[PDB]
Write a protein that binds this ligand. Structure first.
Ligand SMILES: *[C@@H]1O[C@H](CO)[C@@H](O[C@@H]2O[C@H](CO)[C@@H](O)[C@H](O)[C@H]2NC(C)=O)[C@H](O)[C@H]1NC(C)=O
Ligand SMILES: *[C@@H]1O[C@H](CO)[C@@H](O[C@@H]2O[C@H](CO)[C@@H](O)[C@H](O)[C@H]2NC(C)=O)[C@H](O)[C@H]1NC(C)=O
Ligand SMILES: *[C@@H]1O[C@H](CO)[C@@H](O[C@@H]2O[C@H](CO)[C@@H](O)[C@H](O)[C@H]2NC(C)=O)[C@H](O)[C@H]1NC(C)=O
Ligand SMILES: *[C@@H]1O[C@H](CO)[C@@H](O[C@@H]2O[C@H](CO)[C@@H](O)[C@H](O)[C@H]2NC(C)=O)[C@H](O)[C@H]1NC(C)=O
Ligand SMILES: *[C@@H]1O[C@H](CO)[C@@H](O[C@@H]2O[C@H](CO)[C@@H](O)[C@H](O)[C@H]2NC(C)=O)[C@H](O)[C@H]1NC(C)=O
Ligand SMILES: *[C@@H]1O[C@H](CO)[C@@H](O[C@@H]2O[C@H](CO)[C@@H](O)[C@H](O)[C@H]2NC(C)=O)[C@H](O)[C@H]1NC(C)=O
Ligand SMILES: *[C@@H]1O[C@H](CO)[C@@H](O)[C@H](O)[C@H]1NC(C)=O
Ligand SMILES: *[C@@H]1O[C@H](CO)[C@@H](O)[C@H](O)[C@H]1NC(C)=O
Ligand SMILES: *[C@@H]1O[C@H](CO)[C@@H](O)[C@H](O)[C@H]1NC(C)=O
Ligand SMILES: *[C@@H]1O[C@H](CO)[C@@H](O)[C@H](O)[C@H]1NC(C)=O
Ligand SMILES: *[C@@H]1O[C@H](CO)[C@@H](O)[C@H](O)[C@H]1NC(C)=O
Ligand SMILES: *[C@@H]1O[C@H](CO)[C@@H](O)[C@H](O)[C@H]1NC(C)=O
Ligand SMILES: *[C@@H]1O[C@H](CO)[C@@H](O)[C@H](O)[C@H]1NC(C)=O
Ligand SMILES: *[C@@H]1O[C@H](CO)[C@@H](O)[C@H](O)[C@H]1NC(C)=O
Ligand SMILES: *[C@@H]1O[C@H](CO)[C@@H](O)[C@H](O)[C@H]1NC(C)=O
Lengths: 378, 219, 364, 49, 50, 50
């Protein structure tokens, strides 16, 4: 991995950052409120008489078990578009409140029920915001709403005109019934959502969790926060989820970040040996997966700790260096130099009787390569 | 009469715990050092954007509010009441007395004379603050009950208001009133504007202090 | 940028090698931080120790010499200085030299200078008594040695009383060290606070674009976040290069002051304090160094009248190393920085020419 | 960036603290220019004549 | 329809300002090294003999 | 539709080039400090005794 990081076949002595260690999470619990009432859509999608287009209805679906699969696969719908969220992932999310609006329009007016359109319907009958989130469903209803002689009971604002629906109308003039589901998320504690299956609960293992919508990874631990009846979870400055409340038992649990750091490789150079030592940076050396040695800089594997002290060779950190000496690899607290007491007294002096002439070199960069790039040709 | 709030009408903008973190928010608040009406003991007021509402007593003369646009039939309204039993939220089309109240035998409730088309029901000294707001068909109510060591004057201090209720009504509101228990045998009204505040959070997660960032240059 | 999610991580591969460059830059500036310290403090070969019985002519260095009963074996003034001044993909690497090692280096420099003068910075350390070293330093600023030896107790009392005031003024100023800490923390916080901006997307969470959104469209909302987060990371890495180039020049100046004020006596004006440089002492600080500069300042001046030369026997006499002065009626020679008048003789003057070309000659 | 318009300000609010950083950077530069001049010229205790 | 174009305008105008500020930062560090040389010259060539 | 694909290449390559030029400007300023120090050593160590 070091040879690959450097793009070479010979690595010289040093210490190289090679990747990023990381623990794996086991299991994938799923907490969700109890199971009761799968929502009876068979009232809004199964009504005997719909509502006009200029006074649409507005049903506020609420806490329930919603199964958008019976909708999505019913194959009876001529139009099923989802905007904020693709359809198959509806039975795996939870919101605060679903609204369902219902009305009846012509056949070729179903393309104005969408975010950002214009026309007599979207202008002033029913306007969808520009960041819509829900889904729009529509199906033909010629046999129910159109009657011989003209059904003049379905009006629209243009101040009011009436579709005269008749059974011998070409498609695109026959009545279509439309239902617009709009999922909203105010700031409550929870609400209706797909009924997966939910599961038990663990504590003290990297895990992949979902708490009624909150998807994450980490270790879960018993808390001692003083949450409030309105305070479920408590994020952290810089805005990361750190605590949750379990919906079923209503207890606060902290969410720690699975052990993760960096991995460095210490090598004496491939022209000396192919042995290697490995530093897991600021990781406690008991959770890494011979010589395991704990440092203020992390856990070191593959070097032995000696009691001598040499001049620093390969710098590990916090006063620790490594060398290939003691044939193998080892660690130690580098030495600053040899000790020396000067024979100081108040009437003693040292005077030199000889000298040496010394010549030493000093090297300095003056210049670098002059390069130009044509910005356009690049 | 009119009076001066000092630092009053701060509510938790939402759930989500929190500790020592001078967190900054933009919302509808009651500005610091404001001009709050004074009422003694009452009339139809406006709403226009939320309402602060305090009250002081040991008995219970303040027995809920009534809301809406017309406070009558032909359009829907809310009604929040409390007899000596407990709270009664209700949403019908009513016919409200132009001077509606309840007595204190102890027979009462000359409040309305109609309860048609009900679309929501529910049944079951002192300083009692309330913040009422109405956004996206939800009617939110924050509240707090502090004990004064006076009887009926607006004190000074800091006390954040915790959310109580949430009603998915859809109702339009433009006016509101009050309800009082007569004699047979003091309250204020602020309004809320879009301000920006700096809230100081304790280590338990409660708001202990705040800064209104549009009062003066120091703020 | 991605936070352990394979969808974002595959889109990121389309951006080439930006994230190998950013790491190369940060590694290059983390290695030079240890190079900065090595060149200020490892200016000795031996670790010198001071003698157990400490009689330095009346001078008292006890507040700047190491203290064994203290933390990390620091001096008393090195403690006042150390008392005055878990995320996603972000780590802090420890420095190669601990604080104990740097306090060891400064105590070796300080025991070398108290005990050998400037000889250990040129070769082997040669001991000399401390007052004779002080007399050499007085010679280096142009005062004679008898002025030190006749004022030894006063000069030592002034030095002790002036070291006693550093300790008060600090115990009761390290803003240049505080500012570099503050700047780095303010930048690291701005980096994390950007992980919660949309940059024109539906949310700031990948589990919200990935949850409520297919795998073929999310590719437009994830790219919006990738571009913003890359921009923010690269801004962080540019401003660190520009801040490290400034810390580097400060450490290069500190390394020159350690050579020229601690292992020598400087003649450069206002380079090692204000006054005439006598000597300097180093002390370690959290991410830097404090120099204590000891200088000579002249005081209590009088006026006299002067002449450039003296005429006598038709000759013009000039002082060998002083100035001719007059107390009103008599003519003496002093040295120029300290008043000490002498009789004008043929031992402290020299002759050149006759006394009609100089302007200002006096007869004496 | 925006400049008067209001459709621009709400869109730019989505970028975080990019503009706060730039103003800090430019203010540091301007405070350094006065210290440059103080260090070159105010090297004297008294105003001598 | 307009938000799409306004975001392109914003991106370009923010890139221009970052280029400007980064170059002012690099150009001020060059002026500081020059004022530092001037301070040393004023100390050592005007207040003394070198 | 060539235009929409060409614009992403233009955007990426412009940013590449700008990163190269900024890091050359920061490195030339380090080379200039070295060359000023070498000029000062040439004057003070070769043309005199220090
Ligand atoms: C959902 O079901 C669980 C059990 O599956 C209910 O938990 C019970 O709660 C009562 C508290 O009133 C305990 O006395 C029971 O022992 C619990 N049962 C188990 C098996 O733990 C839970 O109350 C149900 N949800 C609601 C809202 O009632
Ligand atoms: C509305 O109610 C009808 C009748 O209960 C449902 O129609 C059923 O659809 C399924 C699947 O297409 C068929 O297998 C059944 O035969 C249908 N019912 C009858 C009586 O034949 C319809 O699914 C309901 N609509 C919705 C949206 O749930
Ligand atoms: C050098 O100065 C120090 C003062 O900092 C002297 O040490 C203190 O002297 C006072 C006065 O007698 C005592 O109360 C303290 O206990 C001393 N020790 C401390 C403060 O650590 C020290 O005696 C002086 N050295 C000489 C040789 O006189
Ligand atoms: C040196 O002599 C001069 C000449 O008198 C003194 O300077 C004068 O001092 C008086 C009183 O302080 C002032 O009023 C004059 O303005 C000064 N300048 C003149 C007269 O030109 C000076 O005090 C003497 N210096 C010392 C150290 O004694
Ligand atoms: C200048 O200094 C001389 C010192 O040489 C003074 O003259 C001597 O003063 C002492 C004491 O007043 C006498 O004992 C000597 O006899 C004097 N002459 C000599 C040759 O020593 C002189 O008074 C001083 N002048 C002024 C103005 O202070
Ligand atoms: C300094 O001494 C010389 C010699 O003693 C003086 O020169 C004499 O000056 C007088 C008066 O001007 C003349 O009459 C003599 O002819 C000069 N002799 C010579 C050899 O030059 C000189 O004037 C004295 N200077 C002062 C200021 O008194
Ligand atoms: C590298 O290898 C060459 C030849 O194999 C050898 O001469 C040289 O000493 C080696 N270098 C080191 C540092 O061992
Ligand atoms: C690693 O964990 C063990 C178990 O709690 C602990 O004793 C040890 O001190 C930890 N490592 C460090 C460096 O503290
Ligand atoms: C190093 O010396 C210490 C002295 O306290 C001793 O306890 C330890 O066993 C020694 N280590 C080795 C590897 O011998
Ligand atoms: C509140 O406003 C009214 C409006 O006329 C004014 O008379 C009164 O003085 C104001 N009160 C305060 C405390 O400013
Ligand atoms: C209190 O008032 C409500 C309002 O309808 C009523 O339902 C309730 O019965 C009253 N309490 C009693 C004890 O009657
Ligand atoms: C509301 O009440 C009035 C009168 O009682 C009635 O005419 C009307 O139909 C009611 N509303 C609805 C939706 O039934
Ligand atoms: C509230 O009143 C306004 C009057 O401008 C009206 O347009 C609006 O539709 C009403 N609210 C609802 C939910 O109908
Ligand atoms: C609440 O806060 C107080 C003071 O901030 C603290 O002493 C206490 O431990 C906290 N928790 C409680 C009271 O449960
Ligand atoms: C000094 O100036 C005075 C004027 O007061 C003059 O008489 C004298 O000749 C001058 N002497 C010198 C040496 O310049």
């Amino acid at each position: 991995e070091t040879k690959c990081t450097l793009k070479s076949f010979t690595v010289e002595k040093g210490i190289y950052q090679t990747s990023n260690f990381r623990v794996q999470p086991t299991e994938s619990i799923v907490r969700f409120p109890n199971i009761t009432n799968l929502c009876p859509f068979g009232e809004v999608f199964n009504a005997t008489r719909f509502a006009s287009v200029y006074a649409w209805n507005r049903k506020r679906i609420s806490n329930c078990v919603a199964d958008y699969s019976v909708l999505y696969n019913s194959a009876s719908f001529s139009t099923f578009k989802c905007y904020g969220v693709s359809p198959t992932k509806l039975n795996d999310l939870c919101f605060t409140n679903v609204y369902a609006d219902s009305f009846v329009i012509r056949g070729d007016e179903v393309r104005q029920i969408a975010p950002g359109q214009t026309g007599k319907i979207a202008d002033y009958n029913y306007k969808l915001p520009d960041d819509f989130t829900g889904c729009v469903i529509a199906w033909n209803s010629n046999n129910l709403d159109s009657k011989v002689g003209g059904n003049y009971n379905y009006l629209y604002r243009l101040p009011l005109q009436s579709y005269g629906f008749q059974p011998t109308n070409g498609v695109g003039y026959q009545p279509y019934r439309v239902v617009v589901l709009s999922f909203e998320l105010l700031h409550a504690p929870a609400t209706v959502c797909g009924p997966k299956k939910s599961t038990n609960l663990v504590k003290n293992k990297c895990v992949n969790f979902n708490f009624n919508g909150l998807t994450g990874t980490g270790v879960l631990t018993e808390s001692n926060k003083k949450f409030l009846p309105f305070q479920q979870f408590g994020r952290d400055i810089a805005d990361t989820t750190d605590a949750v409340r379990d919906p079923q038992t209503l207890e606060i649990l902290d969410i720690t970040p699975c052990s993760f750091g960096g991995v460095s490789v210490i090598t004496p150079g491939t022209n000396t040996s192919n042995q290697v030592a490995v530093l897991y940076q600021d990781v406690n050396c008991t959770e890494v997966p011979s010589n395991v040695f704990q440092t203020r800089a992390g856990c070191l594997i593959g070097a032995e700790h000696v009691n001598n002290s040499y001049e620093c060779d390969i710098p590990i950190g916090a006063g620790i260096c490594a060398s290939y000496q003691t044939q193998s690899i080892i660690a130690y607290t580098m030495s600053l130099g040899a000790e020396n007491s000067v024979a100081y007294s108040n009437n003693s002096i040292a005077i030199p009787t000889n000298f040496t002439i010394s010549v030493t070199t000093e090297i300095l960069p003056v210049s670098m390569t002059k390069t130009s790039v044509d910005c356009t040709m690049y | 009469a009119y009076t001066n709030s000092f630092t009053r009408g701060v509510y938790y903008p939402d759930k989500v715990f929190r500790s020592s973190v001078l967190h900054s928010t933009q919302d509808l608040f009651l500005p610091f050092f404001s001009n709050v009406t004074w009422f003694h003991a009452n009339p139809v007021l406006p709403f226009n954007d939320g309402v602060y509402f305090a009250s002081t007593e040991k008995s219970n003369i303040i027995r809920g509010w009534i809301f809406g646009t017309t406070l009558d039939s032909k359009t829907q309204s809310l009604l929040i009441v409390n007899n000596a039993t407990n709270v009664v939220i209700k949403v019908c089309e009513f016919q409200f007395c132009n001077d509606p109240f309840l007595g204190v035998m102890e027979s009462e409730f000359r409040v309305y004379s109609s309860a048609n088309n009900c679309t929501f029901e529910y049944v079951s000294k002192n300083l009692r603050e309330f913040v009422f707001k109405n956004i996206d068909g939800y009617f939110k109510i924050y509240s707090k009950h502090t004990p004064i060591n006076l009887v009926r004057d607006l004190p000074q201090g800091f006390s954040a208001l915790e959310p109580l209720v949430d009603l998915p009504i859809g109702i339009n509101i433009t006016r509101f009133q009050t309800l009082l228990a007569l004699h047979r045998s003091a309250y204020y009204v602020g309004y809320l504007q879009p301000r920006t505040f700096l809230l100081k959070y304790n280590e338990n997660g409660t708001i202990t202090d705040a800064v209104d960032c549009a009062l003066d240059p120091l703020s | 940028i991605c936070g352990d999610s394979t969808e974002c991580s595959n889109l990121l591969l389309q951006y080439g090698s930006f994230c190998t460059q950013l790491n190369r830059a940060l590694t290059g500036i983390a290695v030079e931080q240890d190079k900065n310290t090595q060149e200020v403090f490892a200016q000795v070969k031996q670790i010198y120790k001071t003698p157990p019985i400490k009689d330095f002519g009346g001078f008292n260095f006890s507040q700047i010499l190491p203290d064994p009963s203290k933390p990390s074996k620091r001096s008393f003034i090195e403690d006042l200085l150390f008392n005055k001044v878990k995320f996603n993909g972000l780590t802090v690497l420890p420095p190669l030299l601990t604080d104990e090692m740097i306090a060891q280096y400064t105590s070796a420099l300080l025991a070398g200078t108290i005990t050998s003068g400037w000889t250990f910075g040129a070769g082997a350390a040669l001991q000399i008594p401390f007052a004779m070293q002080m007399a050499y330093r007085f010679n280096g600023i142009g005062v004679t040695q008898n002025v030190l030896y006749e004022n030894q107790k006063l000069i030592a009392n002034q030095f002790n009383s002036a070291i006693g005031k550093i300790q008060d003024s600090l115990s009761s100023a390290l803003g240049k060290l505080q500012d570099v800490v503050n700047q780095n923390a303010q930048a690291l916080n701005t980096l994390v606070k950007q992980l919660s901006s949309n940059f024109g997307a539906i949310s700031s969470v990948l589990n919200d674009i990935l949850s409520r959104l297919d795998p073929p469209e999310a590719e437009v909302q994830i790219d919006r976040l990738i571009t913003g987060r890359l921009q923010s990371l690269q801004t962080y890495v540019t401003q660190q290069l520009i801040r490290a180039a400034e810390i580097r020049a400060s450490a290069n100046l500190a390394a020159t002051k350690m050579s020229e004020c601690v292992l020598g006596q400087s003649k450069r004006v206002d380079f090692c304090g204000k006054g005439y440089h006598l000597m300097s002492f180093p002390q370690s600080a959290p991410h830097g160094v404090v120099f204590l500069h000891v200088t000579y300042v002249p005081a209590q001046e009088k006026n006299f009248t002067t002449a450039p030369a003296i005429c006598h026997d038709g000759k013009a006499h000039f002082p060998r190393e002083g100035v001719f002065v007059s107390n009103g009626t008599h003519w003496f020679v002093t040295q120029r920085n300290f008043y000490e008048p002498q009789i004008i003789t043929t031992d402290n003057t020299f002759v050149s020419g006759n006394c009609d070309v100089v302007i200002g000659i006096v007869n004496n």
